[PDB]
Amino acid sequence: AKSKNHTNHNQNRKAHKNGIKKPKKHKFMSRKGLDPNFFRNQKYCLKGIQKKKKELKLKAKQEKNN
Amino acid sequence: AVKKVGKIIKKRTKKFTRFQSNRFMRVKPAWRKPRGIDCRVRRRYKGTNLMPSIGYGSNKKTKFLLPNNKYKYVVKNVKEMEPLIMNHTKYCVQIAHNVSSKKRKQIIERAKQMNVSVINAKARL
RNA sequence: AGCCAGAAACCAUGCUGAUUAAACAAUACUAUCUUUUUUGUUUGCUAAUGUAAAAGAGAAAUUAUAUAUGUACCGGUACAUA
RNA sequence: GGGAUAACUGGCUUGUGGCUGCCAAGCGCUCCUAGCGACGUAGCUUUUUGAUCCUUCGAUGUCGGCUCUUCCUAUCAUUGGGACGCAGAAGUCUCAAAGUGUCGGAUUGUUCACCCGCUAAUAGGGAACGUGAGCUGGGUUUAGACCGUCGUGAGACAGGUUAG
């Protein structure tokens, strides 16, 4: 029964009451969707680097104890 | 208007008696805050019965003080003398509603020993 | 600018009202009383008080306004004076 | 439940209606304008009809007539005039004017309309669409009933009729 249709009125003013919130801008981002093959090689590289670090850490610690 | 006595300034003498209390006979004179719409009180039209306001509140040095210059302490037993002696220079005795004449007289005598006047001293005589 | 006559219109006149004017004038008779002076007016009552304005509550030409008033002559003319 | 929403007033507007203009091609023998006045174009008003849905639905009694008074003028007549296509008699356009007047019937539910007749002329409007604790109740419009059309039907109809 005979309604009014629309208005954008006050909505912008309401938005400015708490301001328009913006990105948190993280340095790391979850990478599920990113380039297969290249990213699984990156996973192998990363695992490789971790293994390299582990080998270095274990040998150095064992050397220090002796 | 404003009522200075020494460094005791009291802002308002006239009590904030309730909106149009004589107009509707059922109304009593003690304050009640309208939750009404267009009440001519909260909707703050000048020339009506004034709202009470915290701004009218007493200065912190005075707070509850009397023109007597001593804070009133109400007394219904003789034993109440014992703190009142140490505070006599800052506090005054008022004798309570109930107090039987024999006891009341004894308290009045005690108050004189304490060197503090009773503000309702002539009562029950 | 200055004027004139001119309508069933207009305003008086006329006529009606006028405790519409909290209106008023003249006249007639009357109420222990009026008039002058002194002191008082810090069971409902039985002496008795009120002022919107004292402070020197001071002041009577007049048409005037692109001119007035006297005085002298015959509403005018002449002469003074603000 | 609803003035969140019609029918009644009021209100805004004035398309539509009504009234007043401006003009100058013609008409008016002859002659633009005595009288006219198109094709055009400007206003005013709300006695029209609308558009509307702000106001009122725990109610502003829903038409008309009768009766009764007052206001308006955009004057029909009476008073004074101006112009004329005016010889007089008339008559016609026009202005100041709202002091005064503006009727009897026939037919209607009727504003309106339409005859017949008088008149001196029988102008136009406002007042909560003047006027229902003034009246009336004929009509739209409660519940009964009738005919036509429409609806299979029950029923429906700003279709008509009688009783309330």
Added chain:
RNA sequence: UGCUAUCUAGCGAAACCACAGCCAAGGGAACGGGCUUGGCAAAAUCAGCGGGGAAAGAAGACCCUGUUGAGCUUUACUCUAG
């Protein structure tokens, strides 16, 4: 003309009632008894009367609305007595 009304003596209610009670215009929820500005405005009453109180009444019977109904009908849906 009767009977009433009227006036007295006697007995003696009710509906109604925000507060009330002179206008005019304005603005305003767009028609005010109160508001703003104007007009104004002087007790108390008796008898009437119907202009107003958008007078009194009854939760608009009209209209619209409700995922409230009820009544009725059919070749609406689902049944069912017969």
Added chain:
RNA sequence: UCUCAAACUCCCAAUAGGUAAAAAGGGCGAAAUAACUCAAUUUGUAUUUCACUCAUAUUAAAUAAAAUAACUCCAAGUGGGCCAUUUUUGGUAAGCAGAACUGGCGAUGAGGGAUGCUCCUAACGCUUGGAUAAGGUGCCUAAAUAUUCGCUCAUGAGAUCCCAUAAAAGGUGUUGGUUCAUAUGAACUAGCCCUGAAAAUGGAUGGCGCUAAAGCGGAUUACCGAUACCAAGCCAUAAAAAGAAGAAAAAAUUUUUUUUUAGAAUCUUUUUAUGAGUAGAAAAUCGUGGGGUUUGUGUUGAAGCGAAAUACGUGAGUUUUCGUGGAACAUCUCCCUAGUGCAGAUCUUGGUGGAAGUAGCAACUAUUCAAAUGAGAACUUUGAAGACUGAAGUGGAGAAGGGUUUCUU
């Protein structure tokens, strides 16, 4: 070549929009890792470890009561809005319907706009003073019958946005201009004014009034003018400081006498800022019934109630006096509990008013005189009159129904 387009486009704004201005990072180097990568294990890619080093010792452009920022949780109210400027669509238009941006109102006082929810000024604790704003300054009505230059007379003039009418068109009213001609004749032009310009209670520049304005158009000041603005005090809220023990004065006659002498964290001292508000949320309070607890009040009259109080509290309230009154009353010491706070509901219930000594006591023809009774007689009784019912009777009888209403005293 003339004129053109929302749904045409060669070109093409303002406004609005986005990215940018370095340290969890960026430079240039080395070394590592791969199952990615190329002919090619440094051929790159990307990552990792080590290096060397980029402004910030005024900050790689400003400016910032920039953390009052984030973020999580839990929830409310709301979902019918409206008004204004500017852009704007439909519709003849509309205080009409529909949009856009922003600001208002809603939810808002205050001062002006004569009045007025919205226009303008401006957002508000309580006060004192100042100086201003919007706006005014003839009087109502506070300040100028101010100054200063023009224009303006109207036999319905005109006078502050919204705002309450007004146009095309005329004018030998007056005022300036400007083009022409020969201090004159033309033609135009816009200022004021006039005509164009009619309505409904009596009638509206707000009214009175105003014309050497108190009109219209300027300018020049002064004065007046708000709860806005500045300074000051006080209150509360918000934030910030800071904090877990020692002699001052007066009176006397060196000593006597008089006053004071703070350390309780939701606390005390201090400072600055802030103070709108419906729907709504929170906290702090105040009161009522009962319970435990604590330590009191009672018949040398309490509670209760009416009237009050130089009373206290912003306030709800609290406290108290007098009068009435005659029996039970508190707890704020702490804490539990609840049939816990009223002006309103055509509230429920009870009482009561104004309306009002009014409406009214109008069917049915009529009573009078005298006497008696009694306190008292229009309407009791007795008598006399007058009248009426008028055999379908206010007459007799019976049924229903009632039930001692009968009858005497």
Added chain:
RNA sequence: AUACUGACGUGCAAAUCGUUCAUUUCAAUCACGUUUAGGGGCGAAAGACUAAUCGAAAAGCCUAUUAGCUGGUUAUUUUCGA
């Protein structure tokens, strides 16, 4: 119980009263007793009537039925606030 749309319309009365009018030997009127009961009766049909009750009586209960709708919804100050 036709009309005066009479009087009355806070009544004499929640339908009376006055005058007018229809009926009056039959499908007549009256009494008493009796029958038929609630989605049922009964109806010379008007949805009429069935105890001031009817397009579904009265009584009691399921029931405090249900209601997106109407009305009302109770001391104080302070803070943030659509």
Added chain:
RNA sequence: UCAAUUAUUUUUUUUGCUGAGGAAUUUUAAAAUUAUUUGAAUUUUUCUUCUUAUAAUUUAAGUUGUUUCUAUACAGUACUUUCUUAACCCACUCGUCUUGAAACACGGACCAAGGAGUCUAGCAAAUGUGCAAGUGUAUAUGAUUCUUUAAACAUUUUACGCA
């Protein structure tokens, strides 16, 4: 005569309003000013400047002083303060739903008393509290438990809920 208008400055005549505070070490320190003292300066000084040493003081470092009066009172006609009309200026029926009510919107003659977010179930977050890889002690048993006891107390090592 030596304007005027800017610039930096220096005064002055009357006068209005205000007085918070209260300094056991920020009413302290320096400054200022005065009387001293030493060294300099320069526009050269009877308010010339700095710093060297000493004192006082205030312009520092939020009112103090003097004189009246109340009054030589005991409540008075004064003073305090309540009530009461006045008078100037301002002031529209409250509640209510509605964007919007002083309304020609709705409810309300008046006064008194009574009169409306509760209780149970289950759940959630919050905050407190006790314990922690456990927790609760369920039904129930037990007791030298018997007005108040209808609670309180206890529970001779794989029960159950939830984790």
Added chain:
RNA sequence: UGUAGGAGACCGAUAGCAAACAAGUACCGUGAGGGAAAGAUGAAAUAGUACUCAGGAAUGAGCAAUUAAAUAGUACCUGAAA
């Protein structure tokens, strides 16, 4: 539910059972049914208004009189507001 005990962080006469009481009564309804209003003098009435006067009487007043108390007199506690 009937009867008997014992209870209470229950109500305190508009509440609590409809019923503190001569209430399941009065009263209303044709009937089924519906269904109230309604407590308090004082310690003691074996203290309940004696007596007098004026009154036709009701009543009133008293120098008279009970009580601690009669604006405590049986429509008797207190006695608010309108």
